[PDB]
Amino acid sequence: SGFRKMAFPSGKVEGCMVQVTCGTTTLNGLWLDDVVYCPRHVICTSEDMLNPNYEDLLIRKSNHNFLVQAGNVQLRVIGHSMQNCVLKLKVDTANPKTPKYKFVRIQPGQTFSVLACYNGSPSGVYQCAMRPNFTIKGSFLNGSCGSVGFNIDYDCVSFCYMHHMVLPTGVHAGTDLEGNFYGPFVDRQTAQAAGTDTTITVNVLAWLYAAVINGDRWFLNRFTTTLNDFNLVAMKYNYEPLTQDHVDILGPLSAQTGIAVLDMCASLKELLQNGMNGRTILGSALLEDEFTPFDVVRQCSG
Amino acid sequence: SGFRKMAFPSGKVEGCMVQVTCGTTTLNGLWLDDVVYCPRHVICTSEDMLNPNYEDLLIRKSNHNFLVQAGNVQLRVIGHSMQNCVLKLKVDTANPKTPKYKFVRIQPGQTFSVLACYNGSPSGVYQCAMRPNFTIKGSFLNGSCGSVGFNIDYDCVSFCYMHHMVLPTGVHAGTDLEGNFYGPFVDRQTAQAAGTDTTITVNVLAWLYAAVINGDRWFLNRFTTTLNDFNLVAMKYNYEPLTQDHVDILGPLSAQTGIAVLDMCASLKELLQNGMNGRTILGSALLEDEFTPFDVVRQCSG
């Protein structure tokens, strides 16, 4: 009756990670087909990062200022383009380890795996959520920059995130693989406020369903509620509003457990209003919001 | 200031997982050099599992009863041996994807990554601890059997665990790669009691050091304690005794934070005796014991 926060197998992504340097600045890149992708701030020093003019900085850089490494192999560049906040470095060899892949822009509340790398070398993999305020609560030390987030469907790697910045608050911000930031953030070493963050209500519910499936059902009550009245309580505890789309998305879990989505919401309501009284759910003392309904399904069905 | 439970990159292990079937029974195997390794209970039906005579069951099985698959390739066997609770199936091709590897027997309290597979196909990776009572709190659905646990050092995969059983309580038990069970367990569908489980004290301390490093230090006090008096309290809350070896192992973390191991223990004491008072440490409301001192170092230093 086990339930673990599982990342996707990282093998397809490991063979795509490279090192990218200029000057004192090294970070991680992603080598796909004949293109390396990395944060454009690789071209900056720490002084440049206060107020970088990326256009003007990019004009001063030589191909040969960019040392792309891959293990104990150094690669060579034949064309370079800035797309938003990503640098595309066309290279002298198409990665033979290129998986089938797509680039996707995910929505707040969606999950993905991160392959944390230091210097183009994989160190670890973890599963996380994109927060409603478009930050990531990551584990990123000096030069985990350029580490990517992904989902795997069948044979296809869907790349959705590239780490760019740690905010003064210690949370992470990054871009899609076209180089557009998630959230209001910019690649400048400046004061940048994230929004109020909220809990991903639909994910919490999914995880309560996981808990029922795995045999942990003390929090079930025979109260119910409407969506509208649930959302009154939710809004008070900085939970995201739940929509009928969210209810629809929970239907397979409702079907499996014989527990109506709106009855699970009424359980959650009592949890929010009364706490856990020192009890745990799936071995956790807080309500977990980093499993989507899809994640719970995938893990419960194989 | 992020701290995540990270698994090792799984690529080296993904290219070693295969499917093994007999009858209605399929499960995961590990294909290294010219040998496939899998739980010996692959040769059993669910009826056989009450009281299997593995010697006699093994005598009735034909090579050709064993369908080893690898993606969309089926492999063929030339020799078979039972080593303890593992079957070794010598095969007609040395895995070209074989990494550098070792087989190790780990100690309770040590961590490792599991590549959860269904039918020889990787589904996910997670980090876990071997509990003091030699169970694993896993995520293993029907035929995640034969899924392996591992650590990576540099270029070398150290295989330490193979999942065999779910206990009636829902926890998992398994063997080393020589087929010796961790703990008192046996591969029979019978009533088997795990010990009282305890919390891995040294790991909790390591994680408190992680918390200090990441800026979360409300629980620091200016009390201290002796080891002997700490262990009085620990024993009351079903914490493993802390030894001078454990103190020694925490020295690098003590050095980095300027907090003496015994002062951190006195912090832990107050935590055990008073709870958290609704506060969190590293975003958790319980004390985490699945990070070793080595894990905390590796994550904090790159």
Residue numbers in the entry:
A (entry chain A), B (entry chain A): 1 to 302
Copy the relevant paper text.
We identified a 5-fluoro-benzothiazole-containing small molecule, TKB272, through fluorine-scanning of the benzothiazole moiety, which more potently inhibits the enzymatic activity of SARS-CoV-2's main protease (Mpro) and more effectively blocks the infectivity and replication of all SARS-CoV-2 strains examined including Omicron variants such as SARS-CoV-2XBB1.5 and SARS-CoV-2EG.5.1 than two Mpro inhibitors: nirmatrelvir and ensitrelvir. X-ray structural analyses and mass-spectrometric data showed that the E166V substitution disrupts the critical dimerization-initiating Ser1′-E166 interactions, thereby limiting nirmatrelvir's Mpro inhibition but that TKB272 nevertheless forms a tight binding with Mpro's catalytic active sight even in the presence of the E166V substitution.
However, the X-ray structure of MproE166V with nirmatrelvir yielded an apo structure devoid of any nirmatrelvir density. This absence of density can be attributed to the reduced affinity of nirmatrelvir for the E166V variants. In this apo structure, we observed a significant shift in the position of the N-terminal residue S1′. The substitution of the acidic side chain of glutamate with the hydrophobic residue valine appears to be the primary reason for this reduction in binding affinity toward nirmatrelvir. In contrast, MproE166V showed a substantial shift to a monomer-dominant equilibrium with a monomer percentage of 61.3% and a dimer percentage of 38.7%, suggesting that E166 affects the initiation of enzyme dimerization and that the proportion forming MproE166V dimers is much less than that of MproWT. Of note, when MproE166V was treated with nirmatrelvir, the monomer peaks of 10+, 11+, 12+, and 13+ charge states were substantially greater than those in dimeric MproE166V-TKB272, suggesting that the binding of nirmatrelvir to MproE166V became weak. Structurally, nirmatrelvir lacks any P1′ moiety, which leaves the S1'subsite empty (left), however, TKB272 has the P1′-well-filling benzothiazole moiety (right) as well as a fluorine atom at 5-position of the benzothiazole that forms effective halogen bonds with amino acids of the active-site cavity of MproWT, playing a pivotal role in enhancing TKB272's binding affinity to MproWT.
